[PDB]
Amino acid sequence: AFSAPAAYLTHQQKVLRLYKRALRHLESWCVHRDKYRYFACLMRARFDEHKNEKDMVKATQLLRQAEEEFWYGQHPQPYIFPESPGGTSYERYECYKVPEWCLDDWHPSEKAMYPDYFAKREQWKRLRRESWEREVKQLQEETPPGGPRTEALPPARKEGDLPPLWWHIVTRPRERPM
Amino acid sequence: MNPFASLTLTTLTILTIPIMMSNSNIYKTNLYPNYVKTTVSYAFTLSLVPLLMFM
Amino acid sequence: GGVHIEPRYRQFPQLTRSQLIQAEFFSATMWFWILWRFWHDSDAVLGHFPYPDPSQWTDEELGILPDDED
Amino acid sequence: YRHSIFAVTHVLIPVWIIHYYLKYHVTAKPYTVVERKPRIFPGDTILETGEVIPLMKEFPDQH
Amino acid sequence: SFPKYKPSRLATLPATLDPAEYDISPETRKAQAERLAIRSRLKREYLLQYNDPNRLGVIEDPALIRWTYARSANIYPNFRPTPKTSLLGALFGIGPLFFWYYVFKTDRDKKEKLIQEGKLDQTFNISY
Amino acid sequence: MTLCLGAITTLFTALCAITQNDIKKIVAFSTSSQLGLMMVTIGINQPHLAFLHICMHAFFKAMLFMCSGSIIHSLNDEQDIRKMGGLYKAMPFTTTALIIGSLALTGMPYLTGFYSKDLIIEAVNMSYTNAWALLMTLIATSLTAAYSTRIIFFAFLGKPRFPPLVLINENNPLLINSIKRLLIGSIFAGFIISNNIPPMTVPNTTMPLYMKMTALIVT
Amino acid sequence: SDAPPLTLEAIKDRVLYVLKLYDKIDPEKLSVNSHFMKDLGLDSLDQVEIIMAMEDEFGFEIPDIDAEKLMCPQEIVDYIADKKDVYE
Amino acid sequence: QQERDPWYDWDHPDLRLNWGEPIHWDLDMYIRNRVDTSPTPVSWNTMCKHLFGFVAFMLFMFWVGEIYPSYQPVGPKQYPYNDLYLERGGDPTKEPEPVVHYEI
Amino acid sequence: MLKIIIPTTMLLPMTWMSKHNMIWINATVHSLLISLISLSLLNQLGENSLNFSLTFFSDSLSAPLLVLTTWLLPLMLMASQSHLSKETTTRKKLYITMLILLQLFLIMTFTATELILFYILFEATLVPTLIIITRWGNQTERLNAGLYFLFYTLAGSLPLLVALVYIQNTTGSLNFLIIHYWSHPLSNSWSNIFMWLACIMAFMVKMPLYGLHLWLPKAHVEAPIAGSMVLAAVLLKLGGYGMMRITTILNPLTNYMAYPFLMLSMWGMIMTSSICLRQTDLKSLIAYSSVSHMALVIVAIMIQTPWSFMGATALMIAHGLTSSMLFCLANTNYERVHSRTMILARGLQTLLPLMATWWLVASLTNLALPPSINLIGELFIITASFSWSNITIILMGMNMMITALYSLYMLITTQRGKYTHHINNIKPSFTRENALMALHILPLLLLTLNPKMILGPLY
Amino acid sequence: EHGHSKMELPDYKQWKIEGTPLETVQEKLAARGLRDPWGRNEAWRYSGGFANNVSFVGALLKGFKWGFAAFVVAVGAEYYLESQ
Amino acid sequence: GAHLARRYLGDASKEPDPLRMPTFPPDYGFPERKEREMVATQQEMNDAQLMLQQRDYCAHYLIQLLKCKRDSFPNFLACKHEQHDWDYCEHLDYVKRMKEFERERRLLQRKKRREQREAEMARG
Amino acid sequence: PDSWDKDVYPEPPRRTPAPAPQTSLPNPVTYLTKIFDLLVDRPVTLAREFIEQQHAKNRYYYYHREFRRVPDITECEEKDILCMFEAEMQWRRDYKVDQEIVNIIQERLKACQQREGESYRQNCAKELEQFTQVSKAFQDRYSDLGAHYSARKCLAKQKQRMLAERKAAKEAAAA
Ligand SMILES: CCCCCCCCCCCCCCCCC[C@@H](O)O[C@H](CO[C@H](O)CCCCCCCCCCCCCCC)COP(=O)(O)OCC[N+](C)(C)C
Ligand SMILES: CCCCCCCC/C=C\CCCCCCCC(=O)O[C@H](COC(=O)CCCCCCC/C=C/CCCCCCCC)COP(=O)(O)OCCN
Ligand SMILES: CCCCCCCCCCCC(=O)SCCNC(=O)CCNC(=O)[C@H](O)C(C)(C)COP(=O)(O)O
């Protein structure tokens, strides 16, 4: 989510992802805590018998057959956290997220209420106004010729500088705005 | 005379009053849910009478 | 609308005597009602009129002639 | 007091309005309100006529 | 020795079951790197156009306009009468019409015959 | 057609419900199974009995959903039963309410559900109808008992399995009063209604002893 | 809900609490800034097991791309706080 | 587009779409609110066979049970007044054939 | 009838003599006054008609259409007030002149005691609409659209004129009263077949009939908001009014000449309802929904039963109102997005809640929710078709389902979901737009109280 | 009014495998040569008020005793009141 | 069920098909032929307007039960003797139906045995 | 009420049983009825009395319109537009009157269905036969004319029906 993706996933990453998926579906299968702990230790052991495999052409055949086994017993109704992309409350509060720029359209009668918040709002707007002009130059000078290769942005390197393209990340509405 | 029809229509019509009041000031306060709950309870109590008459 | 109950973090949550006594009372009334209805109205589960046996009926009442009259 | 005023402005007034509307406008036209005729059982007496309804024929009562 | 998963049109094949996500070659890695590079270029362009405080409008997406034009206003200029196109058009534009015409004509012929001969029990059929 | 549709509906929905893990989905499939049973009742030419079952099902199924919602709210918006553990003692009022509702659902004698479902079973057993539909109805009742057992066992009997931050709380007068009214309903309303309405169908006065207890035995 | 607004101190306390119940880590040697494979000599599988244990502890699951680079208790705390929008 | 990565920071999180990337011809068919081709735990052919086999078996068994119904060892119910001729249809000016019921 | 025609004519000098900053107020106020005056025609009688003079007469089929036409103009003025702000005073006066001329032509067309005058005004309505479409249209395709909107129509109606004069050479008159009283059957002959075709194809093309509807999406998409309003609301009903007026002489030939058109309409309703499901444009979706509803009305007219006529009239009125409101909502969205694409603007109920409510009500009205007059016409036509043939319901039923689908689809894609992040020019809805929405929607819910006002002469 | 009382976390050393079914898991894992490192983290589920469990039949018969006593006293009162 | 199993697994002819019952004259059994007695007349039974399915030989007890329910409304469980009498009369009616079933079954069995004996005698 | 003619819309004598309290337990129905009278019927009755006495001070009448009889289409010339017009209007008025007659019969049938309760199948025979006769006559009169119905089309339908009846009678009588 917050981290930029890479061009490809290494064997280590695929092994870790398979291990996590297997553990999650095992705890979905093994409802109780003691049974899950026993079978998770057993599956970690059976996953550990081939840690020190040296040749890559044989270690890729082990994970390839492990992905054929996981699919067969993958518990077609797994446990999903409520806020996860499959959970029951995934995007429940997504309609309560109102953008900050909407406050620019408030009537002056409504802006009479909450004066300190709006004063801080022009303060933030001015800060962004100078920061963006700095960041355009910083990102233009730091980019390699021909365009970026990965969508990872550099931080701020001077004293008064701010990280390039920061306005829409720090001004997230909230997790539960209302 | 004939309380049965009057009460049977009255429960249905008093189920409708909060819908009309939804444009009033009470809809903008926190007393609206309690208002609707009290309206429903009163409607149930009123409608208990035609059931007794039929029984 | 209730009383102040604190989170526990791996301990048993606080329980007020009111909810426990209310749940126990409601379960007791349920079981008492079941027993009272079973005692006073027991035919609702077992029946009141016995099921007659077709084989016990004699041919006199069933209009059966000894296979010679007709 | 809150329930007292609620029962007047939300129950009593609708009852009055509907009773007036049904008694003096709805029933002013024929067949608007039709009532299923009351059940009649042996031994009953009709208020309009006053004659008694004949009873049953004393069927043999045994258990 | 487990039963094998058979992908279908409406139930595709999982990424972890792809037999092409293992036999990795340097050409595949180069292709992935180029894909990430162009994706990052587009993302950087969008983010530069998105965080600008002087912008007070909609960021025009060439892909969306191109998709709409392709779906709407480009179908005819690339149309060519071919046996497949001709047969499909004739079927989908003629066959249902004659099918429904035949069905309704048969039903109404039966109804009219039953009217003429006289056993249909048209009682209470006042409003038509 | 109505009988066959009701039988297939109740059987399929009960079979789906027996193996689900979301409490709301299981209660929804229970509602669908009850609707299928009522459609079977319509198919065997007993409309008034179907209406009676509507009236009782309203009470106890509404209270079952209310208890499920109380559990979900007290458990930080969690619906899956794999993360529901020991709630028999941690939150007792909802436990006893759901136990009463499940007993009423399964047609336990002299409850709101017995006075309708028991008559449904007796009527469907003594009717010149489809035998396959009768078998499907019996299996559906057994499966109803089975997933009620599943709900109770997986939500109230085992050790706790939720996140360590315990926030269980039932001490709110609105919840308690709303649940208790439906408790009183699901306990007494069946008897009151059955004894307070005029008879609208002929009774099955005589009954084979095994056939009389068939619903209880299968449950 | 009536859920209290968890703070940075609470998050750090819960993170350390989960870490200390993991007997493979010495309770008297672990610190908030302790690294996993360097300061504690752990393995990647142990790292993902800690990630999942914290996932169950806090009731939300971290994506793998973000989980595979959370290497210190302090940055795990900071990630959770950023996810939950914690003020102080 | 339901099976796209839900954890990547898309420019259109609801649609799982990115700014600039070529849009699929049938995008409006695949908008997470319509048909999705996400892989299933069970193969499509096996699900199809199981579903239609279950439906066909249920229909066939319903037909079989219709052929072989279930009833009780009883005769038909008897109604006194000429099988309720007057109360079922009426027509009192025909005087139908009387039916008498055999008391046993 | 002159008490309404004369004020419509006097609207032109008042507009041309008004101040450069007061034309809209005068036009709106006097158009509303004219609509109030025209409300008097709604008092129809079960007897023959309101025969004002030898040239103009009013019936209970013409009266609701006249009232709707008079009521439409203020709504069009309010809708066009926005996008004509930077327009010169002379060109704004020309636009208002075109609108007033179109209303005058429609008003004279809907009375039209004589058939040749009816045809002349029927084609006179074509010029101001073409000028509006081709002149004040934003996109480059408008010209082509205008061409289509012209030629199709003329291709339909040029034979009709000949047929018309031919009738007057045989019958001797084209007055609708004399035509109705002196009606004689058409024998089964090739000449009568071609006369039937000439009379019917003129009004089939403008309704439009499936297969002749290609001009309609172009004309509605490329026209300005007022043009879309007048095309969807009133200009589509000219074909239905003409068919109900002219089918009095085509019997009994229609009993077997309506089969191709009945089949075409009953399949084109399904085809266009399915087309609405996959559309990348809001205006095209609304246009195809209009095509489906008009195909249903064509089916009703071809059935030729009293319930068919009642349902056809009610459906025409309700569809005109609903389509006008939907086009207004789409234009309000477009004026902020400037793209006219369904998926670019999303999650608008978070930003504009009252506009979301208006969208919901318009979608429900299009979805034919009881007890709206939309469903009154729908059910009347459905029952009439069922009497015509018990199988038609199947098709009809499918259409209904599909209708609801795309309607809610239009409601869900545009209003529900997450808002588009890079669109920050969504200003709060003006009082003008909300007033326009209310003036569109309140007459529908008030007419559902008194359906007989729009049920036609066969009520 | 909210629940702000500064709740403190309990001591982490009280959580033990003893008296829990995790003992059996540890024995079965050691019989093969393995250990479960996360055993104590789930000890709280078997330590406090969650230590005692109830059977399904015991759960069903929640208020059997009080209901039976009420039924007995009611039937006794009915017997002693009718006989007069 | 036993009858269903015997009919669907043995011979169908020996046991009746409940749709066509009865298949033998009522006077075949005994000649006295006592008729069933109804105590509820046309007019009173119509006035009670019970139900078409409730207008059977058990009508008088149902009428009495309805009358006692109407008379003592507030205490609904007041009249239980009348309900028991109606239930007993329905039970007797069902027993009569079962007796008819068994009588028809035994008449058919006797007819089959007589036909078999006649065929065996004629064969020789 | 004397507002409508009792003969056009008949009702039975409406006999009701007398109360027969078996026990001494006071029912809630009678108490609720009495209290409902007390605080509902009295204010409504007073308001109606006030409105009626206000109405009596201003009494004025409205009249039912009577229409003279005009020659029918059967005695109208082929091209006499005025006589054809008058006959057409008279036929339309008669058609509306026939529709309202059918409406009255349907209302009586529905009232019988509701009032008779469970025995509606037996006690509503007369109304059913009346409705059947009226519906058959109305279908013979006006059915299948079409949207563009007229006096001439109905006359042609009647002439065709009479021709068919005459042919059938001539065939049967001479047989
Ligand atoms: C494209 C978008 C829609 C536009 C409109 C489409 C609808 C137009 C169709 C017009 C109605 C049908 C045309 C002809 C109807 C005549 C009746 C015919 O169909 O029935 C048979 C007639 O058979 C044949 O149709 C005869 C004519 C055959 C030659 C005509 C060409 C047919 C196909 C042409 C398709 C071209 C369509 C596009 C035109 C530009 C029965 O034969 P018969 O009972 O003995 O004679 C009937 C006529 N009588 C009684 C006067 C003597
Ligand atoms: C959007 C495109 C639509 C285009 C129009 C489609 C309809 C075209 C129908 C024909 C148009 C002209 C019809 C003539 C008008 C009626 C006049 C009439 O009926 O008089 C006939 C004349 O009949 C004709 O002349 C008809 C000849 C047709 C000539 C033009 C042919 C146009 C194309 C014909 C095929 C199209 C039909 C289907 C079109 C489908 C829609 C595209 C009798 O003449 P008399 O000599 O007086 O009597 C004979 C006994 N003494
Ligand atoms: C209920 C569903 C059940 C699903 C079962 C699925 C199958 C389970 C059995 C899997 C079989 C295998 O082990 S398949 C074995 C795959 N091949 C290898 O593991 C060789 C090299 N391993 C690595 O490099 C790793 O990264 C490692 C060194 C381990 C850690 O690295 P770190 O130090 O950087 O953490």
Side-chain angles (χ1 to χ4, degrees), chain F residues 1-11 33 35-37 39-40 137:
Chain F
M1 297 206 255
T2 301
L3 178 64
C4 291
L5 192 61
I8 188 166
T9 302
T10 183
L11 182 67
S33 293
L35 293 153
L37 185 69
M39 211 72 88
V40 159
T137 295

Side-chain angles (χ1 to χ4, degrees), chain I residues 188-190 193 197 201 209-212 256-257 260-261 264:
Chain I
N188 201 5
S189 165
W190 292 115
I193 279 171
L197 274 171
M201 293 313 296
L209 176 72
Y210 186 71
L212 304 178
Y256 87 99
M257 275 283 266
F261 307 93
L264 269 171

Side-chain angles (χ1 to χ4, degrees), chain H residues 12 14 26 28-29 34, chain I residues 277-278 343 346 409 418:
Chain H
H12 313 108
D14 48 325
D26 292 321
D28 47 1
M29 201 186 318
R34 285 175 157 195
Chain I
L277 280 171
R278 308 213 39 204
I343 62 170
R346 288 166 274 113
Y409 166 68
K418 187 78 175 310

Side-chain angles (χ1 to χ4, degrees), chain D:
Chain D
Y1 166 76
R2 184 68 179 92
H3 282 303
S4 179
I5 181 182
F6 190 89
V8 177
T9 187
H10 271 67
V11 169
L12 198 51
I13 295 171
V15 176
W16 284 340
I17 297 169
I18 299 163
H19 193 64
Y20 188 96
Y21 170 62
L22 291 173
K23 197 188 164 212
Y24 292 116
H25 283 93
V26 167
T27 53
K29 284 193 32 153
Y31 287 172
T32 55
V33 176
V34 186
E35 291 146 80
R36 176 176 170 178
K37 60 161 187 91
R39 261 174 177 141
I40 292 293
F41 301 123
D44 291 331
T45 295
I46 296 89
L47 297 173
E48 286 99 8
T49 61
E51 58 96 19
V52 76
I53 297 169
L55 291 73
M56 282 274 178
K57 54 152 271 193
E58 60 95 22
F59 45 89
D61 201 285
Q62 172 50 259
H63 182 188

Side-chain angles (χ1 to χ4, degrees), chain I residues 68 105 197 275 279 300 307 309 313 319 326 331 339 364 368 398:
Chain I
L68 175 70
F105 288 156
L197 274 171
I275 278 180
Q279 276 289 323
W307 280 61
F309 274 30
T313 315
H319 162 271
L326 281 165
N331 180 61
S339 169
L364 281 198
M398 300 284 326

